[PDB]
Design an enzyme around this catalytic site. Structure first.
Site, PDB file in Angstrom:
ATOM      1  N   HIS A  46       1.243   6.693 -18.920  1.00  0.00           N
ATOM      2  CA  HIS A  46       1.356   8.150 -18.711  1.00  0.00           C
ATOM      3  C   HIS A  46       0.718   8.618 -17.401  1.00  0.00           C
ATOM      4  CE1 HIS A  46      -2.705   9.261 -20.541  1.00  0.00           C
ATOM      5  NE2 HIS A  46      -2.607  10.168 -19.584  1.00  0.00           N
ATOM      6  N   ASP A  97       1.457   3.250 -24.528  1.00  0.00           N
ATOM      7  CA  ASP A  97       0.876   3.867 -23.342  1.00  0.00           C
ATOM      8  C   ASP A  97       0.030   2.825 -22.639  1.00  0.00           C
ATOM      9  OD1 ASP A  97       0.418   5.873 -21.463  1.00  0.00           O
ATOM     10  OD2 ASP A  97      -1.066   6.901 -22.705  1.00  0.00           O
ATOM     11  N   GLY A 196      -8.607  12.912 -17.352  1.00  0.00           N
ATOM     12  CA  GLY A 196      -9.159  12.090 -16.274  1.00  0.00           C
ATOM     13  C   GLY A 196      -9.783  10.767 -16.718  1.00  0.00           C
ATOM     14  N   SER A 198      -8.149   8.945 -18.949  1.00  0.00           N
ATOM     15  CA  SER A 198      -6.959   8.165 -19.322  1.00  0.00           C
ATOM     16  C   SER A 198      -6.894   6.865 -18.551  1.00  0.00           C
ATOM     17  CB  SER A 198      -5.680   8.978 -19.073  1.00  0.00           C
ATOM     18  OG  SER A 198      -5.617  10.084 -19.962  1.00  0.00           O
TER      19      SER A 198
HETATM   20  C1  LIG Z   1      -6.562  20.541 -21.881  1.00  0.00           C
HETATM   21  N1  LIG Z   1      -6.796  19.119 -22.245  1.00  0.00           N
HETATM   22  C2  LIG Z   1      -6.273  17.972 -21.824  1.00  0.00           C
HETATM   23  C3  LIG Z   1      -6.861  16.929 -22.536  1.00  0.00           C
HETATM   24  C4  LIG Z   1      -6.689  15.514 -22.504  1.00  0.00           C
HETATM   25  N2  LIG Z   1      -7.468  14.796 -23.363  1.00  0.00           N
HETATM   26  C5  LIG Z   1      -7.443  13.440 -23.461  1.00  0.00           C
HETATM   27  C6  LIG Z   1      -8.356  12.785 -24.450  1.00  0.00           C
HETATM   28  O1  LIG Z   1      -8.603  11.598 -24.330  1.00  0.00           O
HETATM   29  N3  LIG Z   1      -8.819  13.565 -25.439  1.00  0.00           N
HETATM   30  C7  LIG Z   1      -9.648  13.212 -26.417  1.00  0.00           C
HETATM   31  N4  LIG Z   1     -10.121  11.980 -26.522  1.00  0.00           N
HETATM   32  N5  LIG Z   1      -9.987  14.122 -27.323  1.00  0.00           N
HETATM   33  C8  LIG Z   1      -6.586  12.723 -22.641  1.00  0.00           C
HETATM   34  N6  LIG Z   1      -6.497  11.368 -22.682  1.00  0.00           N
HETATM   35  N7  LIG Z   1      -5.796  13.413 -21.786  1.00  0.00           N
HETATM   36  C9  LIG Z   1      -5.820  14.772 -21.683  1.00  0.00           C
HETATM   37  N8  LIG Z   1      -4.892  15.315 -20.784  1.00  0.00           N
HETATM   38  C10 LIG Z   1      -3.825  16.177 -21.340  1.00  0.00           C
HETATM   39  C11 LIG Z   1      -2.461  15.500 -21.346  1.00  0.00           C
HETATM   40  C12 LIG Z   1      -1.733  15.749 -20.025  1.00  0.00           C
HETATM   41  C13 LIG Z   1      -2.450  15.237 -18.768  1.00  0.00           C
HETATM   42  C14 LIG Z   1      -3.633  14.280 -18.992  1.00  0.00           C
HETATM   43  C15 LIG Z   1      -4.916  15.014 -19.364  1.00  0.00           C
HETATM   44  C16 LIG Z   1      -7.757  17.568 -23.388  1.00  0.00           C
HETATM   45  N9  LIG Z   1      -7.745  18.908 -23.227  1.00  0.00           N
END
Ligand SMILES: Cn1cc(-c2nc(C(=O)NC(=N)N)c(N)nc2N2CCCCCC2)cn1
Length: 245
Positions: A46, A97, A196, A198
Protein backbone atom coordinates in the site's frame (compact mmCIF):
# COMPACT_ATOMS: atom_id res chain seq x y z
CA UNK A 1 4.33 5.40 16.91
CA UNK A 2 1.83 6.59 19.53
CA UNK A 3 3.42 6.56 23.00
CA UNK A 4 6.40 4.25 23.43
CA UNK A 5 9.88 5.72 23.47
CA UNK A 6 12.49 7.38 21.29
CA UNK A 7 15.25 5.12 20.03
CA UNK A 8 18.13 4.95 17.57
CA UNK A 9 18.95 2.63 14.71
CA UNK A 10 21.28 0.46 16.86
CA UNK A 11 18.16 -0.89 18.63
CA UNK A 12 16.49 -1.87 15.33
CA UNK A 13 19.41 -2.09 12.80
CA UNK A 14 17.26 -3.85 10.13
CA UNK A 15 14.94 -0.82 9.96
CA UNK A 16 14.74 0.70 6.47
CA UNK A 17 13.60 4.28 5.86
CA UNK A 18 11.85 4.63 2.46
CA UNK A 19 11.38 8.01 0.73
CA UNK A 20 10.06 9.14 -2.65
CA UNK A 21 11.37 11.76 -5.06
CA UNK A 22 9.11 14.36 -6.58
CA UNK A 23 8.43 16.26 -9.35
CA UNK A 24 10.92 19.08 -8.93
CA UNK A 25 13.26 17.36 -6.53
CA UNK A 26 11.75 17.33 -3.05
CA UNK A 27 12.07 14.04 -1.18
CA UNK A 28 9.43 13.03 1.36
CA UNK A 29 9.10 10.05 3.71
CA UNK A 30 6.86 7.19 2.55
CA UNK A 31 7.10 4.15 4.82
CA UNK A 32 9.27 1.80 6.87
CA UNK A 33 10.73 -1.55 5.84
CA UNK A 34 13.00 -4.34 7.15
CA UNK A 35 16.28 -5.62 5.74
CA UNK A 36 15.94 -9.40 5.35
CA UNK A 37 19.17 -9.92 3.35
CA UNK A 38 21.92 -7.62 2.04
CA UNK A 39 20.04 -6.80 -1.20
CA UNK A 40 16.39 -7.10 -0.04
CA UNK A 41 14.03 -4.92 2.00
CA UNK A 42 10.50 -6.03 2.84
CA UNK A 43 7.62 -3.57 3.33
CA UNK A 44 3.90 -3.07 2.50
CA UNK A 45 2.39 -2.83 -1.02
CA UNK A 46 0.00 0.00 0.00
CA UNK A 47 3.03 2.27 0.44
CA UNK A 48 3.84 2.10 -3.29
CA UNK A 49 0.58 1.29 -5.10
CA UNK A 50 -0.23 4.93 -6.05
CA UNK A 51 3.30 5.50 -7.45
CA UNK A 52 4.47 2.03 -8.52
CA UNK A 53 7.64 3.25 -10.34
CA UNK A 54 10.88 2.04 -8.69
CA UNK A 55 12.92 5.06 -9.90
CA UNK A 56 10.79 7.32 -7.66
CA UNK A 57 12.13 5.75 -4.41
CA UNK A 58 15.17 6.01 -2.14
CA UNK A 59 15.98 3.59 0.71
CA UNK A 60 18.21 4.42 3.69
CA UNK A 61 19.69 1.91 6.12
CA UNK A 62 21.39 2.86 9.40
CA UNK A 63 19.24 6.01 9.70
CA UNK A 64 18.01 7.20 13.13
CA UNK A 65 16.51 10.57 12.05
CA UNK A 66 13.90 11.57 9.44
CA UNK A 67 15.26 14.69 7.71
CA UNK A 68 18.92 14.70 8.79
CA UNK A 69 21.74 12.27 8.07
CA UNK A 70 22.91 9.69 10.63
CA UNK A 71 26.61 8.86 10.77
CA UNK A 72 27.25 5.55 8.99
CA UNK A 73 23.97 5.44 7.03
CA UNK A 74 23.77 3.97 3.49
CA UNK A 75 21.56 5.25 0.66
CA UNK A 76 20.10 3.03 -2.03
CA UNK A 77 18.23 3.19 -5.26
CA UNK A 78 15.58 0.56 -5.92
CA UNK A 79 16.70 -1.99 -8.49
CA UNK A 80 13.42 -3.90 -8.18
CA UNK A 81 9.97 -3.06 -6.77
CA UNK A 82 7.85 -6.20 -6.31
CA UNK A 83 4.24 -5.69 -5.20
CA UNK A 84 1.93 -8.57 -4.30
CA UNK A 85 -0.26 -9.59 -7.28
CA UNK A 86 -3.23 -10.43 -4.98
CA UNK A 87 -3.18 -7.08 -3.15
CA UNK A 88 -6.57 -5.46 -2.54
CA UNK A 89 -7.92 -2.52 -0.57
CA UNK A 90 -11.43 -2.33 0.85
CA UNK A 91 -12.43 0.72 2.99
CA UNK A 92 -10.15 -0.17 5.92
CA UNK A 93 -8.32 -3.45 5.37
CA UNK A 94 -5.53 -4.19 2.89
CA UNK A 95 -5.15 -7.83 1.83
CA UNK A 96 -1.72 -9.25 0.93
CA UNK A 97 -0.14 -5.99 2.03
CA UNK A 98 3.43 -7.05 1.33
CA UNK A 99 6.18 -5.80 -0.96
CA UNK A 100 9.85 -6.48 -1.72
CA UNK A 101 12.43 -3.87 -2.69
CA UNK A 102 15.77 -5.00 -4.15
CA UNK A 103 18.26 -2.31 -3.17
CA UNK A 104 21.36 -1.22 -5.04
CA UNK A 105 23.67 1.78 -4.51
CA UNK A 106 24.96 4.13 -7.18
CA UNK A 107 28.16 2.12 -6.85
CA UNK A 108 26.05 -0.96 -7.38
CA UNK A 109 26.40 -2.57 -4.02
CA UNK A 110 23.96 -4.07 -1.58
CA UNK A 111 23.99 -3.46 2.28
CA UNK A 112 27.28 -3.89 4.17
CA UNK A 113 26.33 -4.98 7.73
CA UNK A 114 27.70 -2.76 10.51
CA UNK A 115 26.84 -1.68 14.05
CA UNK A 116 23.88 0.29 12.60
CA UNK A 117 22.89 -2.13 9.77
CA UNK A 118 21.95 -5.82 10.28
CA UNK A 119 19.39 -8.24 8.80
CA UNK A 120 16.35 -9.64 10.64
CA UNK A 121 15.37 -13.30 10.54
CA UNK A 122 12.11 -14.41 8.94
CA UNK A 123 9.94 -16.81 10.97
CA UNK A 124 9.55 -20.50 10.16
CA UNK A 125 6.32 -21.15 8.26
CA UNK A 126 3.01 -20.88 10.12
CA UNK A 127 4.97 -20.40 13.40
CA UNK A 128 3.98 -17.31 15.40
CA UNK A 129 4.01 -16.59 19.15
CA UNK A 130 0.89 -17.22 21.25
CA UNK A 131 -1.64 -14.46 21.94
CA UNK A 132 -0.55 -12.13 24.74
CA UNK A 133 3.11 -12.31 23.66
CA UNK A 134 4.79 -8.86 23.81
CA UNK A 135 6.41 -7.72 20.56
CA UNK A 136 8.01 -4.47 19.42
CA UNK A 137 7.20 -2.04 16.60
CA UNK A 138 9.46 0.66 15.16
CA UNK A 139 8.94 3.66 12.90
CA UNK A 140 8.94 7.36 12.03
CA UNK A 141 5.09 7.53 11.98
CA UNK A 142 2.88 10.05 13.77
CA UNK A 143 3.05 10.48 17.54
CA UNK A 144 -0.61 11.44 17.58
CA UNK A 145 -3.44 10.81 15.14
CA UNK A 146 -4.03 14.53 14.81
CA UNK A 147 -0.39 15.45 14.17
CA UNK A 148 0.61 17.12 10.99
CA UNK A 149 4.31 16.34 11.33
CA UNK A 150 6.14 13.06 11.68
CA UNK A 151 8.71 12.79 14.50
CA UNK A 152 12.27 13.65 13.52
CA UNK A 153 13.67 10.86 15.77
CA UNK A 154 12.94 7.14 15.38
CA UNK A 155 10.53 5.58 17.88
CA UNK A 156 9.59 2.15 19.14
CA UNK A 157 7.02 0.63 21.49
CA UNK A 158 5.68 -2.69 22.75
CA UNK A 159 2.31 -4.21 21.83
CA UNK A 160 0.76 -7.59 22.66
CA UNK A 161 -0.43 -10.10 20.05
CA UNK A 162 -4.20 -10.59 19.94
CA UNK A 163 -5.91 -13.83 18.89
CA UNK A 164 -7.58 -14.08 15.54
CA UNK A 165 -10.73 -14.98 17.38
CA UNK A 166 -10.54 -11.91 19.51
CA UNK A 167 -9.65 -9.72 16.57
CA UNK A 168 -12.61 -10.94 14.54
CA UNK A 169 -15.17 -9.83 17.09
CA UNK A 170 -17.46 -7.33 15.49
CA UNK A 171 -16.59 -4.80 18.12
CA UNK A 172 -13.02 -5.14 16.93
CA UNK A 173 -12.58 -5.73 13.21
CA UNK A 174 -15.13 -8.38 12.32
CA UNK A 175 -14.34 -10.05 9.03
CA UNK A 176 -11.91 -7.34 7.92
CA UNK A 177 -9.16 -9.41 9.61
CA UNK A 178 -8.10 -12.64 7.84
CA UNK A 179 -5.75 -15.45 8.92
CA UNK A 180 -2.98 -13.80 6.82
CA UNK A 181 -3.13 -10.79 9.22
CA UNK A 182 -2.11 -10.41 12.88
CA UNK A 183 -3.59 -8.00 15.42
CA UNK A 184 -1.60 -6.38 18.22
CA UNK A 185 -2.36 -3.73 20.82
CA UNK A 186 -1.72 -2.32 24.26
CA UNK A 187 -4.02 -3.54 27.10
CA UNK A 188 -4.80 0.16 27.82
CA UNK A 189 -4.90 1.11 24.08
CA UNK A 190 -2.20 3.60 25.16
CA UNK A 191 0.50 2.89 22.52
CA UNK A 192 0.27 1.81 18.86
CA UNK A 193 1.48 2.12 15.28
CA UNK A 194 0.11 4.99 13.18
CA UNK A 195 0.25 6.70 9.78
CA UNK A 196 3.85 6.65 8.54
CA UNK A 197 4.70 3.44 10.44
CA UNK A 198 3.32 1.34 7.53
CA UNK A 199 5.75 -1.20 6.10
CA UNK A 200 7.84 -1.30 9.28
CA UNK A 201 8.69 -4.25 11.54
CA UNK A 202 6.70 -6.08 14.21
CA UNK A 203 9.49 -8.07 15.88
CA UNK A 204 9.00 -10.92 18.35
CA UNK A 205 11.44 -13.17 20.19
CA UNK A 206 10.79 -16.75 19.05
CA UNK A 207 13.01 -19.53 20.33
CA UNK A 208 15.39 -16.90 21.53
CA UNK A 209 15.63 -15.33 18.16
CA UNK A 210 14.45 -11.86 17.03
CA UNK A 211 11.99 -12.61 14.21
CA UNK A 212 10.10 -10.46 11.70
CA UNK A 213 6.64 -11.63 12.73
CA UNK A 214 4.63 -8.80 11.15
CA UNK A 215 4.68 -5.79 8.84
CA UNK A 216 2.66 -2.68 9.86
CA UNK A 217 -0.39 -2.63 7.53
CA UNK A 218 -3.51 -0.85 8.80
CA UNK A 219 -5.82 0.19 11.62
CA UNK A 220 -8.83 2.33 12.38
CA UNK A 221 -7.43 5.41 14.02
CA UNK A 222 -4.40 4.98 16.21
CA UNK A 223 -4.35 3.83 19.85
CA UNK A 224 -8.19 3.77 19.78
CA UNK A 225 -10.09 1.47 22.15
CA UNK A 226 -11.12 -1.85 20.48
CA UNK A 227 -9.13 -1.02 17.31
CA UNK A 228 -5.82 -2.89 17.32
CA UNK A 229 -2.96 -2.41 14.89
CA UNK A 230 -3.13 -4.84 11.98
CA UNK A 231 -0.04 -6.46 10.55
CA UNK A 232 0.77 -8.64 7.55
CA UNK A 233 1.43 -12.11 8.97
CA UNK A 234 4.94 -12.80 7.58
CA UNK A 235 4.86 -16.56 8.44
CA UNK A 236 2.01 -17.02 5.86
CA UNK A 237 4.05 -15.50 2.94
CA UNK A 238 7.38 -17.40 3.00
CA UNK A 239 6.88 -19.10 -0.40
CA UNK A 240 6.03 -15.71 -1.97
CA UNK A 241 9.13 -14.19 -0.33
CA UNK A 242 11.39 -17.13 -1.27
CA UNK A 243 10.16 -17.25 -4.88
CA UNK A 244 10.60 -13.49 -5.43
CA UNK A 245 14.09 -13.41 -3.81
C1 LIG B 1 -6.15 9.32 10.08
N1 LIG B 1 -5.41 8.05 10.26
C2 LIG B 1 -4.66 7.31 9.45
C3 LIG B 1 -4.21 6.19 10.15
C4 LIG B 1 -3.40 5.08 9.80
N2 LIG B 1 -3.16 4.17 10.78
C5 LIG B 1 -2.40 3.05 10.62
C6 LIG B 1 -2.23 2.14 11.80
O1 LIG B 1 -1.31 1.34 11.80
N3 LIG B 1 -3.14 2.25 12.78
C7 LIG B 1 -3.18 1.56 13.91
N4 LIG B 1 -2.28 0.64 14.21
N5 LIG B 1 -4.18 1.79 14.76
C8 LIG B 1 -1.81 2.81 9.39
N6 LIG B 1 -1.04 1.72 9.15
N7 LIG B 1 -2.04 3.70 8.40
C9 LIG B 1 -2.80 4.82 8.55
N8 LIG B 1 -2.97 5.59 7.39
C10 LIG B 1 -4.34 5.71 6.84
C11 LIG B 1 -4.53 4.90 5.57
C12 LIG B 1 -4.16 5.73 4.34
C13 LIG B 1 -2.71 6.24 4.30
C14 LIG B 1 -1.73 5.60 5.31
C15 LIG B 1 -1.85 6.21 6.70
C16 LIG B 1 -4.76 6.36 11.42
N9 LIG B 1 -5.49 7.49 11.52
Amino acid sequence: IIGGEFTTIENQPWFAAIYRRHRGGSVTYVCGGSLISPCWVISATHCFIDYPKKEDYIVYLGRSRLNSNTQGEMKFEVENLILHKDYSADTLAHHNDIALLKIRSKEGRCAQPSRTIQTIALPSMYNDPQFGTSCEITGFGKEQSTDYLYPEQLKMTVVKLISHRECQQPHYYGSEVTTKMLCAADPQWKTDSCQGDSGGPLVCSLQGRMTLTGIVSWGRGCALKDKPGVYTRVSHFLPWIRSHT
